[PDB]
Amino acid sequence: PLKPEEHEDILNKLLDPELAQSERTEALQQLRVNYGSFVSEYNDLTKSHEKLAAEKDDLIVSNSKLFRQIGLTEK
Amino acid sequence: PLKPEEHEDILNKLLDPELAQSERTEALQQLRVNYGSFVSEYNDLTKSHEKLAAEKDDLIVSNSKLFRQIGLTEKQE
Known part of the structure; x- marks a missing residue:
């Protein structure tokens, strides 16, 4: 996603009450999409991690059973 | 961690140019912390995922031999 610095640039831009409403809505959009x-x-x-954790479990249990x-x- | 709905709520508050500066500042801080x-x-x-993937690869090598x-x-x- 957006690098922390890139996110920071948007937050600083949105800090100005004088920013054109166009740019404000735009920047706000980038944050929404991101x-x-x-x-x-x-x-x-998270799901990919849970699948690996489950597989690792089966692998280790049978590694012991086999040994x-x-x-x-x-x- | 902020639920998409909670985050959208903040983005919506920030859309209004008339929002008090203290409010605008506070909201942006929330977005930064979040x-x-x-x-x-x-x-x-990402790190524990990489570690898991590596361990899995090594366990497959091991089980391949035991089998x-x-x-x-x-x-x-």
Whole structure:
């Protein structure tokens, strides 16, 4: 999304009560779109992270089960 | 962290040029604090995600060997 500095530039621009209403509505739009994407990209990462966590769990549990089983057969 | 609706509420308040300066200043501060807090949570999530992806890759390597090991033996059986 927007780099923190780029976000900062918009906030400083919106601080001026004298900014043309056109630019005000525009800048405010950038913030709206940006946040939209950001929350989207975040929700997805969260889901992608939960899937990996679940897979890692299955992998580690069977890594242990497999290790143990092999030691009963010989080792 | 701000819910999209809570954030939109702030953006709407900021649209009005007649808003008192103290209000405008305060709202913008809220957006800054919220954005910095959002970027941090995102950066942290990205790191643990990368760590998880790496661990998963290593566990697959490991399980690949254990499964094949279990296989050769039951094939010698």
